[PDB]
């Protein structure tokens, strides 16, 4: 099924973006005074925070490339949620229409 293929891919791409995201954030932010997004464990928590949009504001990037990273993480999280939701809708719709004989 295309929808599960798409939902599966995005969820693997998301994990990859969260990991590379953590790595790249630290690389982009070290060098910038006042930057807090500068060790891998907290940076990875930051990435999860960001992908989900949970907005604690305990950590955020202060640099251009940190912020670019942030956006790729947001979009990957947002994209994968839309593809999961759309896959869940496709599943339910095709199952409801077989539950009607249609």
């Amino acid at each position, epitope marked *: 099924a295309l929808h599960w293929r798409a939902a599966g891919a995005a969820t693997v791409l998301l994990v990859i973006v969260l990991l590379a995201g953590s790595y790249l954030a*630290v*690389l982009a932010e070290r060098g*910038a005074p*006042g930057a807090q997004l*500068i060790t*891998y464990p907290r940076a990875l928590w930051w990435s999860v925070e960001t992908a989900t949009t949970v907005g604690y504001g305990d950590l955020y990037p202060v640099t251009l490339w940190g912020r670019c990273v942030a956006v790729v993480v947001m979009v990957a999280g947002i994209t994968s949620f839309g593809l999961v939701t759309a896959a869940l809708a496709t599943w339910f719709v095709g199952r409801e229409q077989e539950r009607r004989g249609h």
Partner: antibody
Amino acid sequence: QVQLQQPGAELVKPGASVKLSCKASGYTFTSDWIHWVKQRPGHGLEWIGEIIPSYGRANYNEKIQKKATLTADKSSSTAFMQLSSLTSEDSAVYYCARERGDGYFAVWGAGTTVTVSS
Amino acid sequence: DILLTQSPAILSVSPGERVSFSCRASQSIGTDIHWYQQRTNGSPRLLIKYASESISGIPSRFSGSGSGTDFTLSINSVESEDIANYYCQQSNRWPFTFGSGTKLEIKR
């Protein structure tokens, strides 16, 4: 075993330039940073800069006069600090240390004593 | 850029007493503070990471506490091998910074 290897000493003439080395061993990850720290005799520790060797990116203490340039060889896993145009203010023990990207210096080298004199 | 203040600069204690080194940060840094011992002519050695987390192969009499801006290294039952300079270091914000150190002197 000894995790970070540095020369014991380096003598340098006023105005001259020296390239210090820090050979690493033990567990290595692409996420490791090598830091350089300066100690003038009788004084404290002073952070100079850091490098991520598996990416070549280096950052420096912008609050002091920039004497250092950091480089790395990924195949021999050596970190280099090029110190240049040295005066006697630059005489000190320079340590290298390893950080696993988690904020603390788990292992240190024994230090290189740099003396600047004619 | 985070300033770490260490008080006092020299601590004189009696053998067997419990000793405490102070490290005050210029702004709130969670528990992102680490401690080092540097004996005479030796290189620094990590004693405590993240304010209170023990390190393998460090005597059980070294401990740490604190959070925010106030941090303490304690030694239970001080002894001769503890004679050394002690530094704190923060990793909360770029750049990493060190305190200025406290020397431990023993009154025998």
